Design a protein around this ligand. Structure first.
Ligand SMILES: *[C@@H]1O[C@H](CO)[C@@H](O[C@@H]2O[C@H](CO)[C@@H](O[C@@H]3O[C@H](CO)[C@@H](O)[C@H](O)[C@@H]3O)[C@H](O)[C@H]2NC(C)=O)[C@H](O)[C@H]1NC(C)=O
Ligand SMILES: *[C@@H]1O[C@H](CO)[C@@H](O[C@@H]2O[C@H](CO)[C@@H](O)[C@H](O)[C@H]2NC(C)=O)[C@H](O)[C@H]1NC(C)=O
Ligand code: NAG
Ligand code: NAG
Length: 285
């Protein structure tokens, strides 16, 4: 009882992070506000990729202007890093597991060439007007305030072509693709370069909707299933014992519990279970 992929749910505003969520490394340490370009400016648009399952890459977009002279980096990643966006914390004063899963956009001056050219990619893909850029900027702000949480897993029926997709992730690469589609809306024209992205895939049958955080944990909810989800999540955080628990839940018993849109789903795992691909997603036309 649904359409093929569950759509990503947006919000009217971005809440402040709970004080329980603290980062070891600060999010967007050099982030400057997005400047306003001159309309007739020429802004080179660069593809940026670097390593974070041998090929797990981080994506970002570069901008260089001819009038400003300076260049800039733009990315979208986790406020408290990947693990906190993928698995929750269990606190004893709460029936429900707590997440620090917020991701957001980061924009700052300068492009660190060595960071991307060493073990990654740095290639110009477009040239847009300042006007376009400014318009793009506006969209980013809206996006930054409506798409507030980071999601790791792409959930698909099988590695085959044409296989049904249950869930799309919402990470850095998806942000880059959103920006490029938006630029395409303005009429921007991309070079024809092979652009491959990292995608972390879970393979399962049709998911089942288990419920929101109050429909599962708390007084008006199932107890056995809540303790089941808790027992599923506990090994993913503080070793060998946890590895065996994870292998038994995911491989032997073919079970996954997916947090998506702040709701809980069940994934009947299958096939190669967890694959990390580096596949082509073409630039928009
Ligand atoms: C998208 O939304 C996020 C979250 O609301 C914004 O993140 C915030 O970005 C600013 C600067 O970009 C951060 O402030 C910085 O703090 C460091 C030290 O903490 C300082 O060295 C910098 O000079 C700057 O003051 C801020 O911490 C960060 N996080 C939060 C929770 O506010 C982001 O700026 C937004 N991006 C866009 C393009 O709208
Ligand atoms: C993931 O989130 C946890 C929970 O907020 C962070 O762990 C806290 O980190 C602060 C600062 O280092 C410590 O003072 C707290 O004691 C930690 N709490 C717990 C429960 O571990 C953690 O830093 C986050 N992960 C990353 C990579 O930033
Ligand atoms: C960005 O500008 C710096 C100089 O400030 C330069 O070292 C770097 O190569 C530039 N990168 C790109 C992609 O233009
Ligand atoms: C990019 O992905 C395609 C799949 O569409 C694959 O055939 C190709 O080998 C990949 N290229 C690289 C450099 O990994």
């Amino acid at each position: 009882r649904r359409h093929w992929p569950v759509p990503y749910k947006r919000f009217d505003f971005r809440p402040k992070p709970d004080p329980y969520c603290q980062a070891k490394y600060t999010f967007c340490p050099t982030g400057s506000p997005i400047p306003v370009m001159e309309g007739d400016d020429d802004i080179e648009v660069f593809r940026l990729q670097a390593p974070v399952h041998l090929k797990i890459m981080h994506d970002a977009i570069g901008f260089r202007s001819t009038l400003t002279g300076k260049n800039y980096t733009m990315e979208w990643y986790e406020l408290f890093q990947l693990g906190n966006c993928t698995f929750p914390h269990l606190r004893p004063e709460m029936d429900a597991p707590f997440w620090c899963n917020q991701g957001a956009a980061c924009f700052f001056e300068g492009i660190d060439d060595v960071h991307w050219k060493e073990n990654g990619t740095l290639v110009q893909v477009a040239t847009i007007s300042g006007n376009m850029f400014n318009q793009m900027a506006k969209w980013v702000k809206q996006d930054n305030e409506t798409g507030i949480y980071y999601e790791t897993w792409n959930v698909k029926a099988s590695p085959e072509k044409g296989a049904e997709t249950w869930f799309d992730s919402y990470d850095c690469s998806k942000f880059v693709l959103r920006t490029f589609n938006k630029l395409a809306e303005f009429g921007a024209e991309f070079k024809n370069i092979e652009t491959n992205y990292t995608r972390i895939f879970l393979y399962s049958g049709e998911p089942t909707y288990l419920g929101n955080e109050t429909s599962v944990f708390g007084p008006t909810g199932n107890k056995t299933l809540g303790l089941a989800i808790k027992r599923f999540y506990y090994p993913f955080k503080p070793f060998l014992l946890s590895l065996l628990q994870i292998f038994d839940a995911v491989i032997v018993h073919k079970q996954f519990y997916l947090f998506y849109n702040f709701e809980y789903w069940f994934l009947p795992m299958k096939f190669p279970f967890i694959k990390i691909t580096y596949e082509e997603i073409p630039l928009p036309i």
